[PDB]
Symmetry: C2
């Protein structure tokens, strides 16, 4: 793998062989990401940012779960056909202060990435959310909460899946994307000044 990727894997325990999916407590939410660049940035820097309204929903869930159970986030990129990983929410939302020229977010919270692996939606499409009109979990919108029993089923399948690919297969590609976009925006800013 890419050498930065080598050290990221070294510092974290991605895709653990033993993960407790039969949660006694917790809250679980779907994250519908706009792009794989967000996911790549999220894994590299251990942070997430939803919309303004999604941030408020997740922040409130985290604060009502204080020292009482995990908040897990199940990640899927819009249009990708796959779930791409799982992280735990680890801080409240900090709405604090170049968001555009460096393509960062207008706020952030800490996440601990746990699973980084592509799971086809057809592997999960059979699980239905009674609190979303019994639609399949794979048709959820961003920050949809998953009832705990259904979340347990989804987490067992993602943890046990023997994936053939993950966003890590394109690590250098997403590094180059981010770098080139940052130069482009900096230049565009410069000329406008």
């Amino acid at each position: 793998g890419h050498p930065v990727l080598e050290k990221l894997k070294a510092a974290h325990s991605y895709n653990p062989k033993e993960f407790e999916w039969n949660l006694k407590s917790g809250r679980v939410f779907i994250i519908k990401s706009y792009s794989e660049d967000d996911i790549h940035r999220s894994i590299k820097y251990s942070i997430w940012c939803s919309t303004e309204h999604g941030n408020k929903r997740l922040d409130s869930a985290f604060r009502c779960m204080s020292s009482k159970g995990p908040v897990y986030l199940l990640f899927s990129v819009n249009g990708s056909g796959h779930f791409c990983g799982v992280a735990e929410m680890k801080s409240p939302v900090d709405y604090g202060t170049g968001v555009w020229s460096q393509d960062k977010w207008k706020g952030k919270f800490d996440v601990q990435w746990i699973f980084v692996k592509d799971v086809p939606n057809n592997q999960l499409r059979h699980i239905r959310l009674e609190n979303n009109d019994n639609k399949p979990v794979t048709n959820s919108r961003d920050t949809q909460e998953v009832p705990l029993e259904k979340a347990k089923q989804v987490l067992k399948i993602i943890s046990s899946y023997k994936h053939t690919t993950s966003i890590f297969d394109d690590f250098a590609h997403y590094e180059k994307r981010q770098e080139e976009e940052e130069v482009v925006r900096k230049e565009r800013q410069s000329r406008n000044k």
Copy 2:
């Protein structure tokens, strides 16, 4: 870039004459999540807002049933500039065919006609304030905030008449490469995930 040429063959951008003194119409701020969205919008003459944002624009367009135009003032989140103006040209389509226009990144689409493609810094506009957004500057608006018609005329006049030094057109090959390289990655991921 050639695609930029096929576009200029079909449309004329930044007209030297544009009526900014609107007799009628409704005008909305559009806040884009990225430059990639802006590039895709200019290329395929489409847009898609949030679910809530689509309902607001759809209702507005259907209510303006030829009585007047619906203009969209575009700004990428965090950018410090506005980057163009388009006219909304259709209602929202949520159909099955809608997704192919965005490779399923968007839940749907509606047609737009881009008119101005030019970077206009917020400091040319921050003095225009919105009595329907608590008198905040028009440049601190959120996605699909409606602009009162008189204030919209002021904004449209400054955008039309501003001597811009750059536009997203100047990065067009960049965003073309971004779209193809990404699409290659997407196909390869899907292939490798079929066994």
